[PDB]
Amino acid sequence: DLEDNWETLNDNLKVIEKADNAAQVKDALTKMRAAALDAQKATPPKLEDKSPDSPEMKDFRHGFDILVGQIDDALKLANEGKVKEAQAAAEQLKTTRNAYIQKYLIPVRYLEWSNIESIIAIAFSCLGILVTLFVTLIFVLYRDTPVVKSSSRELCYIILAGIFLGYVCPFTLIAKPTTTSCYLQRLLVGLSSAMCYSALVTKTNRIARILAGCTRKPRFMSAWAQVIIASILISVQLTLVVTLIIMEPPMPILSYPSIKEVYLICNTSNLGVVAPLGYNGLLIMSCTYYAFKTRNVPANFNEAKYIAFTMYTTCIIWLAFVPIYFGSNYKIITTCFAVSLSVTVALGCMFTPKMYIIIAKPERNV
Amino acid sequence: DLEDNWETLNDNLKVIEKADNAAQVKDALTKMRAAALDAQKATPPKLEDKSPDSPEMKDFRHGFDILVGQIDDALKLANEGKVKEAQAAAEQLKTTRNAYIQKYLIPVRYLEWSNIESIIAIAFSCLGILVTLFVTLIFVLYRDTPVVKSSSRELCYIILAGIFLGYVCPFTLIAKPTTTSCYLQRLLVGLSSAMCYSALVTKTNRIARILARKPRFMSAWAQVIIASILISVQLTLVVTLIIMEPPMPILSYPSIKEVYLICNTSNLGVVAPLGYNGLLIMSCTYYAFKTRNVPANFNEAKYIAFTMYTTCIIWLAFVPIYFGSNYKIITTCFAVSLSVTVALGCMFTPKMYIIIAKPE
Ligand SMILES: CC(C)CCC[C@@H](C)[C@H]1CC[C@H]2[C@@H]3CC=C4C[C@@H](O)CC[C@]4(C)[C@H]3CC[C@]12C
Ligand SMILES: CC(C)CCC[C@@H](C)[C@H]1CC[C@H]2[C@@H]3CC=C4C[C@@H](O)CC[C@]4(C)[C@H]3CC[C@]12C
Ligand SMILES: CC(C)CCC[C@@H](C)[C@H]1CC[C@H]2[C@@H]3CC=C4C[C@@H](O)CC[C@]4(C)[C@H]3CC[C@]12C
Ligand SMILES: CC(C)CCC[C@@H](C)[C@H]1CC[C@H]2[C@@H]3CC=C4C[C@@H](O)CC[C@]4(C)[C@H]3CC[C@]12C
Ligand SMILES: CC(C)CCC[C@@H](C)[C@H]1CC[C@H]2[C@@H]3CC=C4C[C@@H](O)CC[C@]4(C)[C@H]3CC[C@]12C
Ligand SMILES: CC(C)CCC[C@@H](C)[C@H]1CC[C@H]2[C@@H]3CC=C4C[C@@H](O)CC[C@]4(C)[C@H]3CC[C@]12C
Ligand SMILES: CC(C)Nc1cc(-c2csc(N(C)C(=O)c3ccc(F)cc3)n2)ncn1
Ligand SMILES: CC(C)Nc1cc(-c2csc(N(C)C(=O)c3ccc(F)cc3)n2)ncn1
């Protein structure tokens, strides 16, 4: 029985605490190794319907591989004579029991796909991905047409890729926390927005520099210059997010905010959110400055007025996200809607007018 | 404890079998009602992580609502004096335990999204839906262009609609059996293929009729109406079967040790719509072969002919694979996506290339 195998495991760890000889550790470790392997070959009833080679069933067994591996490390020091170092390894076994195996042994709550809020979020993302791919295809098909050629094409592609990845974020956020889902959400949430606003601050800054009324040919105006500038700004976020993923490796952890419920969530720190959020905020603030400066520019069917109201909305979304995310226990769904709403604003305000002039009024397109 | 509540439930049902008085039934029913309500308020360990208002948790409690409701029906007949009719209600309670609750109490096997075969199937369907929506958009954008206008646009929309729906089928088939998923797969598997082969049998019949004063039923409306009547035969056939054989998730016992959660779809529920689709494919192939060397519309008829020979082989292979092996869900999944993929691939890839790669 797996319920009694976990009892032998816990009671033998207590023997290490009150150990006053080498024989009281070696016996309690060998007995613990056999009790851990007996629990590994078992299946918890919440995984009884799952395939023996399902990701959860693989992760369940892997938790015991770490644990049995740690028992081998403790028996190495004990058989050597260094029983003092083997005694300290007992506390390392307790932390393993919580971070890899406990989630499979106690009732753990987490955000399901079944929840109305996550059904709305994923339904909205499917529409988002569909409309984004629709927009992208029209942009690609009407490549050489004067409506799309006149704007920064390569930069609009980065914006669309950022918007697309923005709609992918809820799938990684609503998915039951796994090392992979925790990795991807940190990467995708940080970079999706950074891609949009890195290309947008490049686009709007270029528009602000264009605002000038013999002369000299202006630099960093080229399509390649724009892509390079945007790429350096995105790479700042990529460096920031990846460095944090390295020093704070993504993991599913058990949170205890409620007195009765145990919640399975990602181990993402405040720093893991504030550092990339602050950089996205820096881009959104830079964007809005240039968007406002050029709000009344009538060039490209009042393209600038649409960027301006995209930016005022994004500012409000960002400003609302900080107290909602840091002041409430709705962190997953808040992130979901902050990303999906901010990217919908951009897709809607910035691309719907262009689509209209292309797929509904092609006489004004020429 | 829910494990001991199910013990009281089973042992009191045994008392009804060996009952030789009205007192031995009334006591065993009241004791069973209290034991059922005690099990309903509980949570099985495979649902311990689930929200109390999750679909599984709701369906778990609903199984006891039927069961407690049945105990009320049996106590109605027992208190009346008709203990003979109340005794028969004990066998009706055993089925309720099986068809609605047992799946949450015993380890049950079913096809999960985690399986490599269903990962491939869903990955292939996502590409399918994407390519289908890509094709549809090009068809819609290049509406008035001579390549798409010369054809039956409205019928191609039916073909693509059926093809799209063909790729939607694996999502309903791989999803853990629920009443909804069982309804949707019967509807979608039957109608997806019927949409494709009704619009195609109409298209190819026309091509074959052209092979020869003004000919009738040649119009864009006539084609859509003819296709719609043929689809409605499948819709009538599938819905009538859904009515006389309501879709439900049930526990199958093909393996001596493994219990499977599957949809209660009968051989008839598969053979009747499969046979009609087979009739449509056979009719299609007849006309496709008859007009295999027609050079009109960039050898349009050649692509249909090959599409039809492949679809015949897929259908002919589906019957012994589906009826002769325990790979019924994944077989349906690939029979539908593969047959739809030949149509999308063979018939629409050249149409794209002659629009988006070779604009004359
Ligand atoms: C283009 C837009 C409008 C389509 C959106 C995609 C739709 C079809 C998807 C996205 C989210 C989906 C839901 C995801 C979660 C659940 C919970 C599950 O237990 C039952 C099905 C249900 C309720 C899904 C049904 C289909 C759904 C509504
Ligand atoms: C045309 C486009 C919009 C349709 C494609 C929808 C994509 C986003 C869907 C289709 C099938 C989906 C997967 C189906 C199975 C699972 C199992 C669950 O444990 C985690 C989510 C995961 C991994 C899903 C995530 C989203 C998914 C990849
Ligand atoms: C019309 C098309 C393009 C819509 C997009 C694809 C649909 C079918 C996808 C998108 C997201 C998907 C869902 C995402 C994740 C899960 C969780 C898993 O535990 C059960 C299936 C379920 C609920 C998926 C079923 C299929 C799904 C609803
Ligand atoms: C072209 C479009 C339709 C493809 C987009 C597919 C997206 C939605 C895919 C690509 C990789 C995917 C993820 C791969 C890994 C995991 C970890 C797993 O434990 C839960 C699901 C999750 C988080 C997946 C969900 C869906 C996902 C984010
Ligand atoms: C590129 C085109 C063909 C679209 C492909 C969509 C891809 C990205 C989707 C479709 C189905 C998906 C898978 C559905 C189920 C699972 C099981 C889950 O526990 C881990 C992720 C994994 C393995 C998903 C990864 C992403 C996936 C492979
Ligand atoms: C908008 C139109 C044209 C496309 C149809 C949308 C499709 C993709 C949606 C709508 C309703 C959906 C289903 C609703 C119910 C269930 C039952 C559940 O056990 C898992 C998912 C499953 C099987 C869904 C899968 C996706 C689904 C079939
Ligand atoms: C644990 C999970 C649930 N939470 C997260 C969140 C983040 C994260 C990183 S950056 C960001 N930004 C900028 C916005 O959400 C944002 C962007 C633009 C706006 F207009 C409004 C808001 N969010 N990273 C990791 N984990
Ligand atoms: C129990 C579950 C798993 N199986 C099903 C199957 C059906 C069903 C209805 S019609 C059909 N056809 C025609 C094909 O599958 C078909 C179509 C074209 C081909 F080339 C080959 C085969 N299948 N309906 C409900 N449930």
Side-chain angles (χ1 to χ4, degrees), chain A residues 1 3-84 86-148 150-213 215-216 218-257 262-292 294-304 306-358 360-363 365, chain B residues 1 3-84 86-147 150-212 215 217-254 258-289 291-355 357-359:
Chain A
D1 292 278
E3 47 211 66
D4 292 289
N5 280 146
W6 204 67
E7 184 213 310
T8 310
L9 207 96
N10 222 94
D11 288 319
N12 277 54
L13 211 143
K14 293 165 192 175
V15 179
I16 325 290
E17 187 254 292
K18 58 189 85 185
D20 282 285
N21 53 101
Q24 264 184 33
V25 187
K26 286 175 181 76
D27 182 271
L29 279 167
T30 312
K31 208 176 280 167
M32 216 162 134
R33 204 194 162 172
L37 291 156
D38 261 305
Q40 186 189 55
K41 70 168 197 179
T43 306
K46 59 213 256 178
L47 305 187
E48 74 177 28
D49 288 9
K50 309 270 177 187
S51 173
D53 300 310
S54 59
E56 306 97 324
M57 206 55 210
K58 283 192 172 290
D59 180 36
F60 168 77
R61 288 192 297 267
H62 167 60
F64 288 98
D65 288 322
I66 302 152
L67 195 86
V68 169
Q70 281 179 340
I71 297 157
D72 294 5
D73 298 316
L75 277 156
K76 183 199 173 78
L77 290 154
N79 283 44
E80 262 175 53
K82 298 170 197 291
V83 184
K84 45 196 182 285
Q87 194 184 40
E91 204 65 79
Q92 278 294 304
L93 286 148
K94 229 175 182 287
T95 57
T96 307
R97 172 184 65 92
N98 305 358
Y100 303 100
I101 308 134
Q102 211 171 301
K103 62 169 141 193
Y104 295 118
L105 308 165
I106 50 140
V108 182
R109 285 294 309 266
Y110 55 88
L111 190 66
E112 308 175 305
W113 304 86
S114 303
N115 294 140
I116 320 101
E117 69 263 25
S118 32
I119 285 159
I120 294 156
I122 291 303
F124 182 44
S125 282
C126 293
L127 186 66
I129 286 156
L130 284 180
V131 172
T132 297
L133 289 162
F134 164 83
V135 164
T136 300
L137 192 65
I138 301 292
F139 261 70
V140 167
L141 292 162
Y142 297 83
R143 237 183 301 137
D144 330 317
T145 65
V147 167
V148 343
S150 61
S151 312
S152 312
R153 305 190 289 189
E154 10 287 326
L155 220 51
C156 271
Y157 292 148
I158 300 156
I159 297 173
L160 289 167
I163 280 166
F164 175 80
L165 259 30
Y167 289 120
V168 173
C169 295
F171 294 93
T172 64
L173 288 154
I174 288 143
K176 184 182 176 163
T178 65
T179 303
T180 316
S181 74
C182 297
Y183 194 102
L184 297 181
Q185 71 185 55
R186 286 167 66 162
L187 217 57
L188 265 36
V189 173
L191 286 151
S192 54
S193 307
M195 279 175 85
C196 292
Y197 310 121
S198 290
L200 260 145
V201 69
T202 300
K203 185 170 225 296
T204 63
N205 171 279
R206 182 196 201 264
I207 284 176
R209 288 189 282 128
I210 281 156
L211 251 184
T215 18
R216 202 144 104 174
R219 315 195 95 219
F220 308 96
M221 291 294 185
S222 150
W224 265 134
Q226 287 171 79
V227 159
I228 289 147
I229 290 156
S231 299
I232 297 157
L233 290 161
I234 295 151
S235 75
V236 173
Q237 186 82 130
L238 185 89
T239 296
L240 178 57
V241 163
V242 169
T243 304
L244 283 171
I245 270 165
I246 301 309
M247 62 174 241
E248 288 165 19
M251 278 277 301
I253 61 154
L254 306 165
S255 183
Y256 309 85
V262 172
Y263 267 82
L264 176 70
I265 59 134
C266 289
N267 71 341
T268 315
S269 76
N270 280 305
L271 172 67
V273 176
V274 172
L277 166 82
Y279 184 65
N280 280 358
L282 240 72
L283 295 176
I284 291 155
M285 198 184 66
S286 302
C287 262
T288 308
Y289 169 77
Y290 296 122
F292 177 80
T294 61
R295 64 195 147 105
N296 313 110
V297 171
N300 253 100
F301 318 93
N302 315 117
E303 195 192 46
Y306 292 112
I307 297 171
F309 283 102
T310 291
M311 283 314 129
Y312 310 143
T313 309
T314 300
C315 282
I316 301 314
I317 295 157
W318 192 99
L319 285 160
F321 174 84
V322 182
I324 305 163
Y325 181 92
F326 292 98
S328 82
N329 293 100
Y330 284 89
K331 288 180 185 64
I332 299 164
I333 209 69
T334 303
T335 303
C336 281
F337 283 98
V339 180
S340 69
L341 289 171
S342 50
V343 135
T344 296
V345 179
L347 176 59
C349 307
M350 284 181 67
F351 293 88
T352 295
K354 290 164 172 184
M355 288 289 119
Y356 169 67
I357 312 298
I358 293 166
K361 275 194 160 171
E363 295 287 86
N365 191 327
Chain B
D1 292 278
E3 47 211 66
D4 292 290
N5 280 146
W6 203 67
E7 185 213 310
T8 310
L9 206 97
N10 222 93
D11 288 318
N12 277 54
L13 211 143
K14 293 165 192 175
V15 179
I16 325 291
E17 186 254 292
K18 58 189 86 184
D20 282 285
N21 53 101
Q24 264 185 32
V25 188
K26 280 180 194 74
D27 182 271
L29 279 167
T30 312
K31 208 176 280 167
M32 215 162 134
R33 204 194 162 172
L37 290 156
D38 236 290
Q40 186 188 51
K41 70 167 196 180
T43 304
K46 59 210 255 181
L47 306 187
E48 74 177 28
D49 286 13
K50 308 269 177 187
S51 172
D53 300 310
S54 59
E56 306 97 325
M57 214 54 221
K58 283 192 172 289
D59 181 36
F60 168 77
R61 288 191 298 266
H62 167 59
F64 288 98
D65 288 322
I66 302 152
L67 194 87
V68 170
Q70 280 179 339
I71 296 157
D72 294 5
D73 298 316
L75 277 156
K76 183 199 173 79
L77 290 154
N79 283 44
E80 262 175 53
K82 298 170 197 289
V83 184
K84 45 195 182 285
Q87 194 184 40
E91 204 64 79
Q92 278 294 304
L93 286 148
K94 229 175 181 285
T95 62
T96 308
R97 169 199 85 188
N98 299 1
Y100 303 100
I101 308 161
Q102 209 171 300
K103 62 170 144 190
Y104 298 116
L105 306 166
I106 51 140
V108 298
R109 207 253 191 80
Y110 57 87
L111 180 66
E112 20 158 70
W113 306 86
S114 300
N115 295 140
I116 321 304
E117 68 263 25
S118 32
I119 284 159
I120 294 156
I122 291 304
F124 181 45
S125 281
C126 292
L127 187 65
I129 286 155
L130 284 179
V131 173
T132 297
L133 290 162
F134 164 82
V135 164
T136 300
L137 192 64
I138 301 293
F139 261 70
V140 167
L141 291 163
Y142 297 83
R143 238 183 298 137
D144 20 292
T145 65
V147 166
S150 44
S151 298
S152 330
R153 303 191 290 190
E154 9 288 326
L155 290 190
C156 269
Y157 293 148
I158 297 176
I159 307 271
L160 289 170
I163 283 168
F164 172 83
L165 251 63
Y167 288 121
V168 173
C169 294
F171 294 93
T172 64
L173 288 155
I174 288 142
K176 184 182 176 163
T178 66
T179 304
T180 315
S181 74
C182 297
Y183 265 89
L184 286 184
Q185 71 186 54
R186 286 168 66 162
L187 217 56
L188 265 37
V189 172
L191 286 151
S192 62
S193 307
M195 283 175 82
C196 295
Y197 307 124
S198 296
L200 261 155
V201 71
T202 300
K203 184 171 227 296
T204 65
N205 189 296
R206 209 198 174 218
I207 303 163
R209 278 191 291 132
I210 285 152
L211 252 186
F217 308 97
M218 290 291 182
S219 150
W221 263 136
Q223 286 172 283
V224 159
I225 289 149
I226 290 156
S228 299
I229 296 157
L230 290 160
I231 294 150
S232 75
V233 172
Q234 186 81 129
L235 185 89
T236 296
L237 179 56
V238 164
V239 169
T240 304
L241 283 172
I242 270 165
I243 299 309
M244 62 176 243
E245 288 165 18
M248 276 206 69
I250 65 153
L251 304 170
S252 182
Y253 309 86
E258 233 138 22
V259 183
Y260 296 75
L261 174 70
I262 43 94
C263 289
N264 72 341
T265 314
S266 66
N267 280 307
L268 178 63
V270 175
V271 172
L274 166 82
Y276 180 58
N277 281 183
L279 241 71
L280 291 176
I281 297 150
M282 198 185 65
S283 302
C284 259
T285 308
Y286 169 79
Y287 296 122
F289 177 78
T291 60
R292 71 181 198 100
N293 315 296
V294 172
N297 269 106
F298 319 92
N299 310 293
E300 213 187 53
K302 261 111 170 176
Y303 310 98
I304 298 172
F306 180 79
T307 292
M308 283 314 128
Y309 309 143
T310 309
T311 300
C312 281
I313 301 314
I314 295 157
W315 192 99
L316 284 159
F318 175 84
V319 183
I321 305 163
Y322 181 93
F323 293 97
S325 82
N326 293 100
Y327 284 88
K328 288 180 184 64
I329 300 165
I330 210 68
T331 303
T332 302
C333 281
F334 283 98
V336 180
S337 52
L338 290 170
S339 51
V340 139
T341 296
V342 227
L344 177 59
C346 196
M347 284 179 67
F348 297 88
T349 295
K351 280 171 163 185
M352 294 305 108
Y353 205 88
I354 215 85
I355 288 165
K358 277 179 84 273

